[PDB]
Amino acid sequence: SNVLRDAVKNGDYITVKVALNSNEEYNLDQEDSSGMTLVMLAAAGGQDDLLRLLITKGAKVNGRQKNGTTALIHAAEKNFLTTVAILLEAGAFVNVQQSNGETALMKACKRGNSDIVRLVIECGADCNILSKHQNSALHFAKQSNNVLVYDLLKNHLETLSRVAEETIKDYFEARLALLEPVFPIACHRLCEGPDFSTDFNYKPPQNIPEGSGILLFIFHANFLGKEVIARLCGPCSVQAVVLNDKFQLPVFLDSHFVYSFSPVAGPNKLFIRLTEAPSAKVKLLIGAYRVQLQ
């Protein structure tokens, strides 16, 4: 019973091997008053072989504490690179937030570990996410004054925006032209869930070219290493878009990748409902831009 909890907090690989081949029914998802499961304590202590057994014993990788911390966040806190690698190999959600609004990537940027940064953003992490204090991963990376980390993040986002321009060019045959992003393009892992939510701020410029308009794009994208490729056709995972409790409607009835986006100045709330494919390896690049109608 209790024996496995303290065993996992400490080093007892033989004990766990026997308990895992023994004829006793153990709940490997029990949470103490704090809420930590065996998976996240094991990840807290860098005891990797325990993690391999826990994964091969059917243990939720993506649990959460009462303050919203998953095992992956714990691993990121204490620089246990090998543990992060195995969790990402186990289908762990990367972009979950704590009650304070911080993600794993932010911890890795804060402590200056470039390797974790590469590993998570390559597996589809979102850089522009903000905490309750409106600091992004990028601000932490630059204040920690670790050049490799902030170069990595900056080049990653440069690549994302570049591919957005390229794909819209390809799909509208250049009769249309992007002008200025409305709000930092975000990234969503479909395997993480069917819901998507965010809060942003919109500040219009004085000079609005008459005949120009705002559109929301949901590019369906794949990350292969450092290369990202995206599409605005084919299978769509978008069912509904809600901007401030007002549904937004697609510009076309044949596709659900481009929606009309008429935000009001100041704070805005966006929430999208998606299809459920827990095994989908698809990333969604969500961005609302102004555009010119040629």
Under 8 Å between Cβ of 248 and 242: yes
Which among 80, 94, 104, 273 has a CA at the least distance from the CA of 195?
Answer: 273
Which domain range does residue 29 map to?
3-153
Terminal Cα distance for the chain, rounded: 70
Q: Same domain, yes or no, for 19 and 133? A: yes
* Number of domain units in the chain: 2
**SS3 for 291?**
strand
148 burial level (CB within 10 Å; 0-12, 13-18, 19+):
middle
Q: DSSP state, 130? A: B
Question: Is residue 121 domain-shared with residue 248, that is, in the same domain?
Answer: no
- Tell me: do 287 and 268 sit in the same domain: yes
Spatial distance between the Cα atoms of 208 and 195, rounded to a whole number of angstroms = 33
Same domain, 44 and 148: yes
**Token pair belonging to 9:** 């907090």
Q: What is the CATH number of the domain that holds 251?
A: 2.60.120.780
* CA–CA distances in Å: residue 95 to residues 69, 171, 217: 11, 29, 20
Q: How many other CB atoms sit within 10 Å of the CB of residue 116?
A: 23
Claim to verify: residue 116 and residue 162 sit in the same structural domain: no
Same domain, 68 and 203: no
Domain final residue, candidates 125, 153, 181: 153
Q: Are residues 12 and 142 in the same domain?
A: yes
Distance CA 137, CA 107 (A): 8
- Check: CB of residue 190 under 8 Å from CB of residue 280: yes
CATH of the domain at 125: 1.25.40.20
Q: Which of 153, 171, 191 is the last residue of a domain?
A: 153
Q: Which experimental method was this entry solved with?
A: X-ray
The span from the CA of 208 to the CA of 293, in Å, is 13
Tell me, in Å, the resolution of the deposited structure.
3.0
Q: Tell whether 148 and 281 lie within a shared domain.
A: no
- Residue 268, helix vs strand vs coil: strand
Same domain flag for 142 and 12: yes
3-state class percentages of the chain: helix first, strand second, coil last, to nearest 5: 35, 25, 40
Do 187 and 285 lie in a common domain? yes
Q: Which residue intervals of 33-80 are DSSP H helices?
A: 38-44, 48-55, 71-77
- Final residue of a domain: which of 130, 153, 176? 153
Q: Which two tokens stand for residue 282?
A: 């698809």
Euclidean distance between CA atoms 243 and 182, whole angstroms: 14
Strands annotated E in the chain = 176-181, 186-189, 195-202, 212-224, 227-231, 238-243, 246-248, 258-260, 266-274, 283-293
Q: Are residues 71 and 139 in the same domain?
A: yes
